[PDB]
Amino acid sequence: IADPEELFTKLERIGKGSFGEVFKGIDNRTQQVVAIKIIDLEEAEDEIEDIQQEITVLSQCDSSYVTKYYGSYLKGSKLWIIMEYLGGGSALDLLRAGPFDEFQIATMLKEILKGLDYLHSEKKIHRDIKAANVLLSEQGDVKLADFGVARNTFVGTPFWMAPEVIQQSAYDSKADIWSLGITAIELAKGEPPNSDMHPMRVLFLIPKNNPPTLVGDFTKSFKEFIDACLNKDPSFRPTAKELLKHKFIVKNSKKTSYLTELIDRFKRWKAEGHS
Ligand SMILES: N#CCC1C=CC(=Nc2nc(Nc3cc(C4CC4)[nH]n3)c3ccccc3n2)C=C1
């Protein structure tokens, strides 16, 4: 029990996520830039020791495709979670300057797929693949911010949810393949399919409707990639690994450093006047 208000300095706010706020921060002793997620567990003090149990296990993970956990510190009923800082922004931030071209998308999806194809020893992993959770380093490395293991009273956002997840079927890692498909549409178009519909309506249509498709004169191979992820039968969606060999990814992927151009493109958008 050392006080994190003294160990760390908050700089800018970077996230208005769910349980609280994420900050760009700095460790006062070592000067390492970090990400700090603060969550109030006032009435849920019993939850604390479990949350720190999980943070400690996560910090032993060896994936270079997830934002690493460094530890956590209790202050009052607030828990300060200390994580790796990535300075390039999320894909969703970068999308504000416009959708990405196919070579950028294939490059980004390949890095996501490498992280989905990673063997995790941790017990029951949950994932939330979407553009808000895809982070870029300043050098263009791609890491996901959704990674973890097993009183929240709201249903949630449906747009990236797989059919079998909604029909309440016991769901495996094929659900993340579906969500990756939706995220690919999000990167090409700017938003997930049916983003103009009421969420409760979307939640009912997902299991009943034919899968969404990419609208636009994109290459046939990109549309086939999307079609493969968005199979309605979990069993016939391909694995992360089969997808890493899809001709869309193989033909169009570039070195990850090329994604710095998206960072730069966001800078002139800002320089042009938030627009
Ligand atoms: N918790 C949680 C998920 C999450 C997902 C996205 C997110 N957005 C975001 N995150 C970051 N940076 C970040 C976030 C994290 C860590 C996930 C908390 N590590 N680095 C930046 C950095 C610079 C500009 C904009 C940024 N936006 C912040 C947090």
Residue numbers in the entry: 17 to 166, 176 to 300
Question: What's in the article?
Answer:
The serine/threonine mammalian Ste-20 like kinases (MSTs) are key regulators of apoptosis, cellular proliferation as well as polarization. The four human MSTs are regulated differently by C-terminal regions flanking the catalytic domains. The subfamily GCKIII contains MST3 and MST4 which share almost 90% amino acid identity in the kinase domain but less than 20% in the C-terminal domain. MST4 has been shown to phosphorylate the actin remodeler Ezrin at its regulatory residue T567 resulting in transmission of cell polarization signals.
